[PDB]
Amino acid sequence: GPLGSGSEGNKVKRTSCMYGANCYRKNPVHFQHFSHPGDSDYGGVQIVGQDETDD
Ligand SMILES: Nc1ncnc2c1ncn2[C@@H]1O[C@H](CO)[C@@H](O)[C@H]1O[C@H]1O[C@H](CO)[C@@H](O)[C@H]1O
Ligand SMILES: [Zn+2]
Structure with a gap:
């Protein structure tokens, strides 16, 4: 292979x-x-600020 x-x-x-x-x-x-967060083709989404941004 x-x-x-x-x-x-x-x-x-x-x-x-x-x-x-x-x-x-x-x-x-x-x-x-490799793609990166902030581009139209990003597709990693590995727990980046799930829901702890309320301050
Ligand atoms: N935040 C971040 N961005 C990119 N690469 C990163 C990183 N944190 C750690 N790394 C890479 O993992 C090892 C630690 O196990 C580091 O040495 C980084 O390895 C880089 O070194 C190569 C060039 O010297 C790069 O291709 C990358 O693998
Ligand atoms: Zn990169």
Whole structure:
């Protein structure tokens, strides 16, 4: 089962990044391989402020 074919330029549902909410690194091609919170294709939703923001 060979793999290794994930490349999204700017028109596909990119995979959320390992730390999209805090992705400290930033490259010109990394944004195409991983999506991030704040973009139209983000899709990670890993418990980011469930319901504790009432202050
Ligand atoms: N908040 C945050 N954003 C991105 N990457 C992050 C992170 N918190 C931790 N990491 C990565 O996980 C390990 C800790 O187990 C760190 O060393 C980070 O690894 C990064 O290092 C690579 C480049 O040196 C990156 O590709 C990423 O894996
Ligand atoms: Zn990232």
